[PDB]
Amino acid sequence: TKDNEWAVYTHDSSDPAATAPTTASTTLKFNENGILESGGTVNITTGTINGATAATFSLSFLNSMQQNTGANNIVATNQNGYKPGDLVSYQINNDGTVVGN
Amino acid sequence: SMQINLNSTDPVPSKTPFSVSDADSYNKKGTVTVYDSQGNAHDMNVYFVKTKDNEWAVYTHDSSDPAATAPTTASTTLKFNENGILESGGTVNITTGTINGATAATFSLSFLNSMQQNTGANNIVATNQNGYKPGDLVSYQINNDGTVVGN
């Protein structure tokens, strides 16, 4: 929108519930050095499927930056959770931990 | 830094206006790229105007932003001795101009060891931009002194 202010829109394209994201879900503020000063995190819905609840989660933009160079990009993101799993293998670390892969 | 070598016999009497375009009002148009607080590049246009023997007027101008209005005032002046050695006007704190909230840093532009000599064409023979833009880790390297460095 301007120097050091970016509007953020969010949208769950995995479900119909995610209507046109025409509202500023949030906004990010940066200082003169391009350091994210505000808009750190937002609790954002996941949308829903087969009765599964629309969790919602804290999306953090911590340490995001606005700098002269580069192209708008994503340099690491994390999904704090899992899908279903099947016991592929067994492994023992030299610290005595027994783990499942 | 900006090492300048000027021809002792190159005057500007043809014109007096500037506006980074009146060629006749100056002898040398040099540009030093500098970085503001976000690394945004700026165009330090520098004009050398021979006013007389051993005195050159210096005009400065950031063409990377609108803020850099017509540089019609003598940002500084350089004084040389009879041997063409820069005696004064060594350095000036010059603004970088501004972009996207990035502050207009300002920096010490030195003309140390610049000379006014009979021969050559007005020129620039080494300049330095004390700063950086953004960087991405391309490679790893180890020197035989045990230093580990990032390229």
GROMACS .gro file of N, CA, C and O in nm, chain A residues 86-91 99-101:
model
   36
   86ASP      N    1   0.206  -4.410   0.913
   86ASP     CA    2   0.221  -4.555   0.918
   86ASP      C    3   0.364  -4.595   0.952
   86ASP      O    4   0.459  -4.547   0.890
   87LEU      N    5   0.381  -4.689   1.044
   87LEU     CA    6   0.515  -4.723   1.091
   87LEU      C    7   0.604  -4.785   0.987
   87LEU      O    8   0.600  -4.906   0.964
   88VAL      N    9   0.686  -4.701   0.926
   88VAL     CA   10   0.780  -4.747   0.827
   88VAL      C   11   0.901  -4.816   0.886
   88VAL      O   12   0.936  -4.926   0.844
   89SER      N   13   0.968  -4.753   0.983
   89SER     CA   14   1.087  -4.817   1.036
   89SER      C   15   1.120  -4.785   1.180
   89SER      O   16   1.058  -4.700   1.245
   90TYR      N   17   1.221  -4.855   1.229
   90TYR     CA   18   1.267  -4.848   1.366
   90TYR      C   19   1.407  -4.793   1.367
   90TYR      O   20   1.487  -4.826   1.280
   91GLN      N   21   1.441  -4.712   1.465
   91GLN     CA   22   1.577  -4.665   1.469
   91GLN      C   23   1.621  -4.631   1.610
   91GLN      O   24   1.543  -4.580   1.691
   99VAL      N   25   1.320  -4.453   1.827
   99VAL     CA   26   1.226  -4.372   1.755
   99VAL      C   27   1.162  -4.444   1.642
   99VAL      O   28   1.212  -4.545   1.591
  100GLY      N   29   1.048  -4.391   1.601
  100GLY     CA   30   0.973  -4.448   1.492
  100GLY      C   31   0.975  -4.356   1.374
  100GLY      O   32   0.954  -4.235   1.387
  101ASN      N   33   1.000  -4.413   1.259
  101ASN     CA   34   1.003  -4.336   1.137
  101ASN      C   35   0.881  -4.372   1.060
  101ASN      O   36   0.848  -4.491   1.046
   0.00000   0.00000   0.00000
